[PDB]
Symmetry: D5
Subunit: 184 residues, 10 copies
């Protein structure tokens, strides 16, 4: 990402909205905004194999593993405004388990992009599927969208839930229900 070009675009953005890039509080803003966006879009430049590293261990049992409450932050591709919340992951191993923290690294890889909450859930689930080839995986994303809160409809109490169910989580109703019950 060309930080220098982002800075120039940000400086002009400030002017067009009626601000003064030369005033003290905005002097380093174009630079700060440029670096922030490089970080906020770093997900596009990451590789799944590197993100997981080699933290795949032999399964200790056959029961479902649930990693809940993984906070996430993303940007809606429609308004370029933040949407955030939590991601809950559940899976039944097929001989291999993932290092707990790698789930969060996978979440960040797909969240630090321009997104659609519906896509985010699917991409996370598919990534875990590719890495562990488990019997099944289930991912639930619950978030609040600033594009709905600070502008437009300006609704304050809303939150959205999206999910993706693969393998036995899609095929076995009881398995899915058990996973969702753990989140309640």
């Amino acid at each position: 990402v060309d930080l220098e070009r982002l800075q120039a675009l940000a400086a002009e953005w400030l002017q067009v909205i009626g601000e003064d890039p030369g005033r003290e509080g905005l002097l380093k803003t174009p630079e700060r905004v440029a670096k922030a966006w490089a970080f906020l879009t770093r997900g596009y430049r990451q590789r799944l194999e590197e993100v997981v590293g080699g933290a795949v261990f032999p399964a200790e049992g056959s029961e479902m593993v649930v990693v809940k409450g993984v906070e996430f932050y993303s940007m809606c591709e429609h308004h370029l405004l933040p949407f955030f919340g939590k991601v809950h992951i559940g899976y039944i191993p097929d001989g291999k388990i993932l290092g707990l923290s790698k789930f969060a690294r996978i979440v960040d890889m797909f969240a630090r992009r321009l997104q659609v909450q519906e896509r985010l859930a699917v991409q996370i689930a598919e990534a875990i599927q590719e890495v562990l080839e488990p019997q099944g995986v289930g991912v639930v994303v619950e978030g609040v969208h600033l594009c709905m809160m600070m502008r437009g409809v300006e609704k304050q109490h809303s939150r959205t839930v999206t999910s993706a169910m693969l393998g036995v989580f899609r095929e076995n109703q009881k398995t899915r229900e058990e996973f969702l019950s753990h989140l309640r």
Copy 2:
């Protein structure tokens, strides 16, 4: 369009009939304020579903249920012309198309900003979504408090009412319905 002038005249007369003084300082601008307020509160009748959606329909990203919960709403009961309000929870399973999240709120407001009965509000919201997306199914749950039950009449204070509408797979598939409802708990 609503005749604001007539509304102002009616409101001015309303004030005198209830025993107030339409001429006192604090009520002078009231007929005007009330007229504008009611035009806004009934603006939903004059809206078009096509314009409300604004073509914000996108290709589905997956096959799982999408649940948009806690969309606050405010309406007026057609029986007493007193506000009833709370939240609307929407759930649906796409059939190739998903809706921009905010459009669910815009649809809610379109049907809430009218004289209503909560049972109908749920149905109309669900039917609007079904028409716009033609999803596999849609479920709408409305939960609200009614001032006509709280500030007068029975004057109950702890009551809330839940109404809903289930279409397609939400009406036919028991487990799909149970799954949607469980997300709300």
Copy 3:
């Protein structure tokens, strides 16, 4: 019509027998206050379901369940003449007819303002709704605390009692009943 004069006489003698002084400043108007209170607390026996509903029956807007929860109630246990209170939750599936929301509260009060047993209260409310709407089904859940268990006798403080009545589809369809009960959680 209750004989208020006779109630006052009985209450005045009650004050004497329990050891109090009916002549006290603070007790002078007590017999009169007690008479009026009990006339109100037992007014349910003198009400008619037809008048309580007031013809507030409208055409159904859909086929989904309507749940009116948290209708607070107050009653008197027929065993000790001590209050028991809490909330009544009502669920039903219409068969072409829906009831004005407040009428559920009026029906609750009609049966609550009598001497009762909680098990009966749930049943009578459910049967009343059934008679008025002839719905596909109706379910009533009553949850309350009993002062006769709290301020005397066993003197338990944390206990609460749940009673219910299920009619039509609420009794015949397992999933329907579960759906109603889940809405209460």
Copy 4:
């Protein structure tokens, strides 16, 4: 209040906003609206002496009596939309105490009118002052305003607090603080 005239005004109101007074759901609406408004404005027609009745008893002590959480419902005189919440009352007797329920009857007398929350607090306090002539009285009104929530600014998390302090509640900082602390 002329219920018949209110009904006629309500029937026309329905027509002007684009509705049909003849449809089933609105048949009895003009009548219902008329009766509701007669009840909602009944406060103007009540008398303080009748509302209190004669429920004024000899004081049992000198300490502050606090009656909190008296729910209330009113109508803003500006938009004719409901504003509601709770009223908390505190006072130090001067030989006379009021029957607890009469505080609620006084609240209703002033709430069932077209109001301004700032006025409501003062009128309730002054009424209690006139009835008991206590050493002091304090009234706090906290409410939510539908004219701010369902229209206009459409803010959802706001609530307003107004109050009135008379006698020792105005003069004695510690007395006022003690009353307000009881509400926390």
Copy 5:
């Protein structure tokens, strides 16, 4: 002490006057149950403070105030003969003497099990503690809900009343009173 036979006869007639049938299966033993209940509910009039304390007064261990909060109480309002209940919080600074913790509850019950006014209940509890022990000060706060305000009359649901009595240093020193009250929040 109290004539249970006269109470039973009064209760049996009470059932008749309010519109009930004393012959009903559910009301057969009611007059008897009601008489015994009221005998228990007014037992406080016949209790002696010296016996209530049972000589459970021990030497002080320190100078700091002792706070016994959350002592649940149940009483009857002398105006309507309907229950009012809640909690009693007690704070005191000893002067060489401390009371057995449970004795505070026994004192509460002694005064609560009578016909009362919440303002008096607080004063009588504090005065009793002041008599038994000879503390530097005593503070009693009573917070309760009144059924005469909830199940009839104004029918307000969210209200509760706080009454108190401050003696000795609790009345004298504002900082002591403030500290006692802060412990309750």
Copy 6:
């Protein structure tokens, strides 16, 4: 007025610089959406305090403090152009004039819909109220979360920031300030 066309051009270029495809289906309308969003998010610069208040200033009804709490707000930090949001609490003591409650919210939005620093937001809101009402004093407390601290950089998740501005009696009278702040707890 804001040049939407230039904003769209800048946004379109922004998308390509960050590595995205401005031509893909979901991003086609993005430059347009972003342009309109930012014009709205910075609309506060173009508003006039006189028009915002709309002459909704009324005669004071009393002398006590008025507290309008929980007015939600959303702003953009001038340092990172990322949202910071939360609530604004306002307190003031009238000097002959009170403000229409909703105008407090309109004033908040006027200063929040700009590039800001939370410390300034509190001050400007307080100064605006002081100018419009010339009250005895005014206090404004802003509490918010900052996404620039949450979704990047230090990435702290539990932090909230409180800023305030106290004018007149709120700045000078300790007890008046304490009273205002206590209402917020």
Copy 7:
């Protein structure tokens, strides 16, 4: 029955063996207080189910489940003679006969005021109810905290134990047991 004198002597020797001074001011009346205490805490062994229930068995008002939850209880573990306490929840479906609500609490106390094992407590309570009402089924859930594992031994602080007993339809019917357990949630 229980030889109080013998218990006092045993308690007196207990005080000296553990290292305390039986002649100390605060311990003089201890052996006496402990004796009466344990007589009360073991009174359940001497009670009779017939007397505890009395004649409080009324005709069933309906066929739906009756749930009496939150009946607090206190018992002593037979293994350490240390208290274990919590709540007992009872559910049952009548077969023509319903029990007076307070009798459930009296039955709980009858089996709780003994040396116990929580697994047994739930079973005995269920059997007692089954014997008295002969209902279609009974379900008992006991949830408590044990001081023997909190104030000594493992010294775990967050643990709670749930034991239960299901008879009749509560053991047979899966849906019935589920419905009962759901009411407790």
Copy 8:
């Protein structure tokens, strides 16, 4: 020290006197378990303050108050030999020396594992800290629930007792004590 054999014999006789069978399966090892239990529960009498604190006295890092709250504790009332438990909160201002955090808990256990009176427990803990650190002042607040008044006697369920001890600046300085107590809120 404690003669475990003698306690076992006493516990064995206790079991038969109360009406139980000492030869019963679940009671065979009870007298042994009870003996060791009470030895542990009274171990505080045999501990030495110097050994409990060890050498964990470090140089003060500053002059501000240090507050260690929520230290759970369990003790036995000397009057009934029944447990009373809750939490101990400690606050102090150092005078050049600070204590290792865990030592506060060890001091609490030292005085808690004895036969006690809650008023004394707070005093002893405060004195111990004062003796070990000689700080500018120490404040101790003990809040607990007593089973002797919950599972027997008055059988009150919602009550909690607070006792405290203030030494040095915590007793002298009004603001210091207030600040400490505010931290607990």
Copy 9:
């Protein structure tokens, strides 16, 4: 068992390498404290299940499942040697044998006080219970937070992990497992 002298030497050097001064007043006894701590934290490797249970296996009292929830645990992740902690919930259906409640906690500590992976911890606890008792089934749920995820690396703050192991009927019958899991919500 473990060489405390070697651990001390390793810890002393650890302090030096990370940039600290072992000679500092605050670090003088650290190597010693760290060695003893790790000896305690790995004590589970040297424990014997038979001794942990202490023959506390009693005859079953009923057939219903016993649920021991909220057993707090603390462990160290074998990957980073950083603590992970939370609670362990255990459910089982006996087959003539029930375990002493506290023994479940002792089994938890036996396996937690080792280097672990949460997935294994759940399995080992369940297998131990399955060996000691010969139940029809056992279910163990472990829920914990991991410092290696919170204080370093991804630094996520809101996450917690659930692992479990189901044996016997808990694995076989879905309704049994579901009932166990429902008791935890």
Copy 10:
């Protein structure tokens, strides 16, 4: 720079001494993981306040207090090398200069990622802010839980520790300090 190679060697030997197998699959990369973790956990010693602040000091917008609360932190106790964590709350009154909000979090981390005692942590954070801004005053409150008290030693579970540092007006002005502390409640 820390010698990661040496840390790995020490960690590998640590695994051997505690009784584990360094050759295990799950422990092969542990020495490397532990080395990197500790380098990060002690990175605070290698940071410079000037670089941490990054010149993010701006002109003050007003004279009122700025409170940044809930900044979560994680540290290692210098006594046992076990984590202690919680939150840091910062308050200050500017003297012409304000700090970028995130810098407070960066300052917290600089001092937290070291071996510490909570009393020192509060002081160093406060002194750092003082040096950077030279404000009229600054106050820092640190509230945390210590694993060395929870997972070993006394094993207390409910305890939490509060430490603080007050400089300038926060130390000199009683009301200012109270105002800051009240914002934290």
